[PDB]
Design an enzyme around this catalytic site. Structure first.
Site, PDB file in Angstrom:
ATOM      1  N   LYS A 187     -12.618 -28.307  -0.428  1.00 26.44           N
ATOM      2  CA  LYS A 187     -13.532 -29.401  -0.054  1.00 26.44           C
ATOM      3  C   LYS A 187     -14.507 -28.887   0.993  1.00 26.44           C
ATOM      4  CE  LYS A 187     -10.987 -33.790   0.402  1.00 26.44           C
ATOM      5  NZ  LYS A 187     -10.943 -33.950  -1.072  1.00 26.44           N
TER       6      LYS A 187
HETATM    7  C1  LIG Z   1     -11.973 -40.284  -1.457  1.00 22.65           C
HETATM    8  O1  LIG Z   1     -11.500 -39.331  -0.530  1.00 22.65           O
HETATM    9  C2  LIG Z   1     -10.387 -38.593  -0.887  1.00 22.65           C
HETATM   10  C3  LIG Z   1      -9.834 -38.674  -2.167  1.00 22.65           C
HETATM   11  C4  LIG Z   1      -8.705 -37.920  -2.507  1.00 22.65           C
HETATM   12  C5  LIG Z   1      -8.064 -37.055  -1.605  1.00 22.65           C
HETATM   13  C6  LIG Z   1      -6.817 -36.192  -1.953  1.00 22.65           C
HETATM   14  C7  LIG Z   1      -6.578 -34.962  -1.029  1.00 22.65           C
HETATM   15  O2  LIG Z   1      -7.429 -34.309  -0.590  1.00 22.65           O
HETATM   16  C8  LIG Z   1      -5.065 -34.795  -0.873  1.00 22.65           C
HETATM   17  C9  LIG Z   1      -4.347 -33.730  -0.349  1.00 22.65           C
HETATM   18  C10 LIG Z   1      -2.942 -33.796  -0.318  1.00 22.65           C
HETATM   19  C11 LIG Z   1      -2.291 -34.922  -0.807  1.00 22.65           C
HETATM   20  C12 LIG Z   1      -3.029 -36.001  -1.341  1.00 22.65           C
HETATM   21  C13 LIG Z   1      -4.413 -35.927  -1.372  1.00 22.65           C
HETATM   22  C14 LIG Z   1      -5.451 -36.933  -1.884  1.00 22.65           C
HETATM   23  O3  LIG Z   1      -5.303 -38.045  -2.184  1.00 22.65           O
HETATM   24  C15 LIG Z   1      -8.649 -36.990  -0.336  1.00 22.65           C
HETATM   25  C16 LIG Z   1      -9.773 -37.735   0.028  1.00 22.65           C
END
Ligand SMILES: COc1ccc(C2C(=O)c3ccccc3C2=O)cc1
Ligand SMILES: CCCCCCCC/C=C/CCCCCCCC(=O)OC[C@H](COP(=O)(O)OCCN)OC(=O)CCCCCCC/C=C/CCCCCCCC
Ligand SMILES: CCCCCCCC/C=C/CCCCCCCC(=O)OC[C@H](COP(=O)(O)OCCN)OC(=O)CCCCCCC/C=C/CCCCCCCC
Ligand SMILES: CCCCCCCC/C=C/CCCCCCCC(=O)OC[C@H](COP(=O)(O)OCCN)OC(=O)CCCCCCC/C=C/CCCCCCCC
Ligand SMILES: CC(C)CCC[C@@H](C)[C@H]1CC[C@H]2[C@@H]3CC=C4C[C@@H](OC(=O)CCC(=O)O)CC[C@]4(C)[C@H]3CC[C@]12C
Ligand SMILES: *[C@@H]1O[C@H](CO)[C@@H](O[C@@H]2O[C@H](CO)[C@@H](O)[C@H](O)[C@H]2NC(C)=O)[C@H](O)[C@H]1NC(C)=O
Ligand SMILES: *[C@@H]1O[C@H](CO)[C@@H](O[C@@H]2O[C@H](CO)[C@@H](O)[C@H](O)[C@H]2NC(C)=O)[C@H](O)[C@H]1NC(C)=O
Ligand SMILES: CC(C)CCC[C@@H](C)[C@H]1CC[C@H]2[C@@H]3CC=C4C[C@@H](O)CC[C@]4(C)[C@H]3CC[C@]12C
Ligand SMILES: *[C@@H]1O[C@H](CO)[C@@H](O)[C@H](O)[C@H]1NC(C)=O
EC number: 4.1.1.90
Lengths: 673, 21
Positions: A187
């Site tokens: 990211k």
């Molecule tokens: C909309 O903003 C997000 C959407 C998904 C995530 C992921 C993520 O980066 C992650 C890492 C480890 C365990 C679960 C997750 C998420 O849900 C993070 C931010």
């Protein structure tokens, strides 16, 4: 020994193989591992009928059907429907045994094998949490998590309140930390940092606390993107250390609780929420049940010091020098090291398997890059040419498929072309040549072609370790146009629409404007194109800035002639739709004025939809909870009844078509509606 | 029911995340 307090060991324990093996088999309390095993088994039991598709098995694997399937290995094929039901039953029994702690190893294998078979059967259902579930089952197979709070220790006293080796906790903690850290380094993409991935998410009602001190753009840029990236990059370090464990626990709990409500990701958030009390001390369940009132302390098993266990090596200054680490201890240490190294390496292995590299590297499901890329599809066209007569025909996009993921990958496209080639002769078509024309936009970029439309896919060349040649490159030096594109889209009318298209030199786009699509124009933004009207046969060249009006109900072509890619835009209005809306509004106003001093039916049904939505909003949450529970109960009951029918068929035999139809009708009764 | 014509196959003028189930 400050380092010995922060890390739990000393730098001298890593100076020799024997010392490392002795350290990695240190005895530990098994309470946390047992609690995690119980929760994971319960979640898998709850997840099998819902996301794995036990309730839609009869639809997915129906007998005697023409379907294109997308397995990882073409030598893998599904079994008949009855055997598929048996496979799912064995998986369910294994998960239940894992949850209960009864016959731990056998249940672990019975869940691990069919789960991975079903995972490898279809590439179009791969996501990150299914991959994680497979990994967690594989890890828990080799661990001894039945030493506490289990039926196995209740019926066998040799495995009741025993110690565990240390690497059991090390492997799980390393897995969680790897997931977190590699999700945050993925990211650190320019699309995520600049706020282009999740741009409309801040409009949700859950983010309204943050709007009390920030603008919507600042809320989207700071809370959604930068906050998520920072949480991912720092969660492992916050959880590992005991100074910041509480703050990290609160932060990750809030993060996962919000994510469970914003999206539909099955049980991912609950799995993660219950893997965070595994960075705490291994004795936390004991302290927790001790802190409870003494009234409820006489029904649980009596608290006592854990008994010694064979699997862990014992080193004491007074209690003998120590035993030579056998094969088990060295094998455990080696497994820990090798598994952690492979899990580190795998997300960054895309330079070896180049045949799976499209616009985005690799297949989707094992690189921990969630919600980073979003795709929009404008048009898909499939055309085949008969090899015997030479006639040209057109197919529907996705005739014999059950998903839409074949549009983004070249291996899936090759599989689809081959399946169509083998299926079309059944429909009185000789050996065909199939050409695909697909337009995709990624993260609000220009729409463009992903594959070459001039290449016969069925006879094309694709290899797992060689970069594919009929895949078009992504036009990366056009992204800074997105500000202008957003401004142009925003400065528009409530009845007009716009489409942005970027094309490669040497290719043309043929379009047919619908009858109702009056007042359609094309305007050029870069490069130079020539527009040809098919009926009148008149080429016309456009320069940067001008616009041209197109006729309706006719064909036209746009030829790209510049040496570099050229981008233009389409502006159109639905004259029929606006006329319908205006006459509907006029008639409604006239009728209302007359009363108070199928067009109307459509207006009234839309009004009824609005009334239903607003009344469900006014309805308390208890009715929604009741409906949710009823739907879940119906799904579970249907899955159980179909499984019973299939098992009866397998064990006894197919009785008759009438009884089978009656049973199938019974299984779809919608218990309480 | 598996064939378009050429006036429904050429109409160009007539959001997706893979984590969702
Ligand atoms: C909309 O903003 C997000 C959407 C998904 C995530 C992921 C993520 O980066 C992650 C890492 C480890 C365990 C679960 C997750 C998420 O849900 C993070 C931010
Ligand atoms: C230094 C080696 C790694 C040890 C972790 C150092 C901490 C610094 C930052 C790392 C953040 C989290 C790392 C992942 C956690 C998994 C390891 C772990 O839990 O170790 C702790 C644990 C002690 O735990 P408790 O006594 O509960 O102490 C808790 C502290 N209050 O100690 C150990 O198990 C020692 C393990 C030695 C390392 C083995 C695990 C890591 C293996 C590395 C993977 C790569 C393979 C080969 C590496 C090649 C290059 C070196
Ligand atoms: C013989 C026995 C007969 C039993 C019959 C009982 C009669 C009552 C029938 C009950 C019917 C309900 C069955 C299903 C369970 C509840 C429904 C359910 O889980 O729904 C899923 C629902 C959301 O699903 P969506 O994806 O919205 O579904 C819609 C699909 N688009 O998910 C959940 O609510 C998950 C529920 C599990 C919560 C349990 C705890 C999870 C972990 C949290 C613990 C935190 C950590 C604790 C610390 C310990 C760590 C070591
Ligand atoms: C092995 C199970 C791994 C489970 C997956 C979870 C994540 C693992 C990460 C790997 C993801 C992708 C790598 C897979 C490489 C192997 C794929 C493969 O060989 O088959 C592809 C291809 C089929 O292509 P489709 O597009 O279905 O057919 C087109 C016409 N219908 O098969 C073939 O061409 C025949 C076999 C090719 C050579 C076989 C491999 C020989 C060399 C072995 C080393 C490579 C794999 C090692 C695996 C490492 C462990 C993950
Ligand atoms: C009077 C006649 C019409 C009998 C019809 C009764 C059905 C409505 C019963 C029979 C079998 C029952 C099912 C049998 C087994 C389960 C497993 C059970 O599994 C669990 O998930 C519970 C344990 C856990 O929470 O992990 C959930 C309820 C369910 C689906 C039951 C729901 C209700 C069913 C379908
Ligand atoms: C065809 O559509 C275009 C685009 O909406 C119309 O042009 C607009 O005309 C109004 C005047 O009524 C201006 O205020 C807008 O700024 C114009 N928009 C653009 C993008 O130029 C045009 O009027 C329509 N023509 C017909 C006959 O309906
Ligand atoms: C309109 O312009 C094109 C050039 O842009 C003329 O030539 C065609 O060019 C395309 C793409 O370069 C080729 O695929 C065609 O084979 C070319 N020939 C034809 C007949 O399309 C095109 O001839 C021009 N139209 C007219 C009527 O002169
Ligand atoms: C009956 C059979 C087909 C069911 C599937 C069994 C075999 C093929 C399964 C069971 C355990 C699985 C392994 C479990 C864990 C990993 C680690 C991961 O990083 C890559 C895939 C890999 C290496 C899996 C490959 C497939 C595997 C070996
Ligand atoms: C909008 O236009 C499409 C074709 O572009 C047409 O099929 C549709 O009928 C129009 N809308 C209405 C309400 O007629």
């Amino acid at each position: 020994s400050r380092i010995g307090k922060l890390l739990g060991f000393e730098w001298t324990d890593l100076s020799s193989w024997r010392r490392l093996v002795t350290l990695l088999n240190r005895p530990t309390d098994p309470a946390s591992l047992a609690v995690f095993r119980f929760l994971f088994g319960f979640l898998m039991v709850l997840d099998i009928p819902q996301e794995r598709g036990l309730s839609s098995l009869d639809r997915k694997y129906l007998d005697g059907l023409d379907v294109c399937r997308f397995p990882l290995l073409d030598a893998l094929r599904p079994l008949p429907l009855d055997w598929m039901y048996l496979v799912y039953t064995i998986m369910f029994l294994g998960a239940l045994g894992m949850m209960l702690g009864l016959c731990y190893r056998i249940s672990c294998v019975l869940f691990l094998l069919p789960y991975w078979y079903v995972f490898l059967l279809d590439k179009t259902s791969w996501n990150n949490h299914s991959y994680l579930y497979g990994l967690l089952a594989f890890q828990l197979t080799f661990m001894d998590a039945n030493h506490y709070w289990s039926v196995d220790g209740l019926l066998n006293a040799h495995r009741r309140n025993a110690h565990v080796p240390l690497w059991n906790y090390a492997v799980l903690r390393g897995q969680i930390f790897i997931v977190y850290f590699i999700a945050g380094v993925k990211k650190l993409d320019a699309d995520w940092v600049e706020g282009y991935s999740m741009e409309y998410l801040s409009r949700h009602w859950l983010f309204s606390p943050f709007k009390l001190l920030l603008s919507e753009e600042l809320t989207s840029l700071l809370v959604v993107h930068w906050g998520g990236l920072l949480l991912d990059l720092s969660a492992g370090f916050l959880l590992f250390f005991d100074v910041s464990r509480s703050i990290g626990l609160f932060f990750v709990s809030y993060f996962h609780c919000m994510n469970s409500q914003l999206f539909s990701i099955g049980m991912f958030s609950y799995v993660m929420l219950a893997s965070s009390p595994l960075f705490c001390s291994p004795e936390w369940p004991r302290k927790l049940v001790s802190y409870c009132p003494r009234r409820l302390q006489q029904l649980l098993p009596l608290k006592a010091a854990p008994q010694p266990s064979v699997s862990c090596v014992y080193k004491r200054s007074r209690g003998k020098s120590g035993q030579k680490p056998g094969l088990r201890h060295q094998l455990g240490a080696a497994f820990t090291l090798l598994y952690l190294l492979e899990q580190l390496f795998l997300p960054y292995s895309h330079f070896l398997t180049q045949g799976y590299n499209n616009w985005t590297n690799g297949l989707y499901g094992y690189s921990w890059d969630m919600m980073v890329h979003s795709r929009s599809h404008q048009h898909v066209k499939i055309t085949y040419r008969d090899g015997r007569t030479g006639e040209l025909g057109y197919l529907n996009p996705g005739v014999f498929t059950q998903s839409r993921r074949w549009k983004d990958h070249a291996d899936m496209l090759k599989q689809y072309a081959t399946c169509l080639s083998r299926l079309l002769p059944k429909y009185n078509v000789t050996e065909p040549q199939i050409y695909f024309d697909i337009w995709v936009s990624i993260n609000d970029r220009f729409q463009q072609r992903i594959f070459d439309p001039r290449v016969d896919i069925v006879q094309a060349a694709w290899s797992p370790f060689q970069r594919t040649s009929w895949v078009q490159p992504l036009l990366m030096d056009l992204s800074p146009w997105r500000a202008k594109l957003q401004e142009i889209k925003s400065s528009l009318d409530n009845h007009t629409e716009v489409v942005f298209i970027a094309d490669f030199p040497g290719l043309h786009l043929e379009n047919f404007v619908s009858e109702d699509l009056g007042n359609t124009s094309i305007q050029l933004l870069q490069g130079e194109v020539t527009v040809e009207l098919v009926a009148e046969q008149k080429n016309q060249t456009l320069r940067e800035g001008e616009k041209m009006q197109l006729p309706a109900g006719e064909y036209h072509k746009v030829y790209t002639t510049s040496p570099s890619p050229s981008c233009y835009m389409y502006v159109y209005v639905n004259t029929t739709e606006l006329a319908l809306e205006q006459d509907l509004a006029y008639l409604q106003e006239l009728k209302e004025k007359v009363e108070n001093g199928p067009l109307v039916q459509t207006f009234l049904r839309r009004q009824q939809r609005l009334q239903e939505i607003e009344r469900r909003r006014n309805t308390p949450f208890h009715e929604r909870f009741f409906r949710f529970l009823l739907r879940k109960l119906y799904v579970f009951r249907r899955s159980f009844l179909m499984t019973c029918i299939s098992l009866r068929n397998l064990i006894l035999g197919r009785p008759s078509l009438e009884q089978l139809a009656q049973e199938v009708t019974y299984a779809n009764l919608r218990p309480f509606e | 029911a598996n064939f378009l014509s050429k006036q429904q196959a050429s109409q160009v003028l007539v959001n997706s995340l893979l984590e969702e189930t």
